[PDB]
Amino acid sequence: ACTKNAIAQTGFNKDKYFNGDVWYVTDYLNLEPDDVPKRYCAALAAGTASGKLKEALYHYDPKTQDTFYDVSELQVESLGKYTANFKKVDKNGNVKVAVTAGNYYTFTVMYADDSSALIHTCLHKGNKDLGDLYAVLNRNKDAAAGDKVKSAVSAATLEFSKFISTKENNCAYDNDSLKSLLTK
């Protein structure tokens, strides 16, 4: 179950965040800790494609090799707060699991600048959810979390020390697929 109404960044700059480029997850915190593995790789692209607000997601479990991509049309709830559908696709955008009622995530940008961000998501997939999930993002897949984003974690009344890093998993991404998936 999700429990947090995440507050979007004051003065969030949507066009900068949704610029078509890739964001890498460097650290994450699930409030239901057993909802997700302790080793994981994730990234997304975010942009407007032919007037439509889009995200493309990538998930990879570096131990099991479980891999999946998704394409998401985002609807606006308020500035920096979205409800995303999702269809599971291969890396080329071919549909594996169509959009359906009941499969959606919320997505809140709590903090962002040109290089870093803090987001919250609540996944609903069936009558189930994947509890509250916070993620620290960077444009540079190898970047240690800096002071702007760590301060934002504190301002959310969270402890960065509890976040799990993705950096020791040999994560390798297909940026080209993420960018192209925005159009799909």
Q: Does 59 show up as a binding residue in the annotation?
A: yes
Residue in the block written with tokens 């390798």: 172
Residue whose CB is less far from ligand HEM, 36 or 49: 36
In order, the DSSP letters of 32-53 are SGGGS-SS-EEEEEEEEETTEE
* 122 near ligand HEM (CB under 6 A): no
Q: Out of 57, 74, 118, 149, which residue is the one contacting ligand HEM (CB under 6 A)? A: 57
What does the alpha-carbon distance between residue 51 and residue 74 come to, in Å, rounded to a whole number? 12
State the alpha helices, DSSP H only, in the chain.
14-17, 147-155, 175-181
Residue whose CB is less far from ligand HEM, 95 or 155: 95
**Amino acid (one-letter) located at 53:** L
The single-letter DSSP state of residue 10 is T
Minimum Å gap between C-beta 123 and ligand HEM is 5
- Interacting residues with ligand HEM (CB under 6 A): 25, 28, 36-37, 40, 42, 44, 57, 59, 68, 70, 86, 88, 97, 105, 107, 121, 123, 125, 130, 133, 135
Query: Binding site for heme: what residues are annotated?
Result: 59
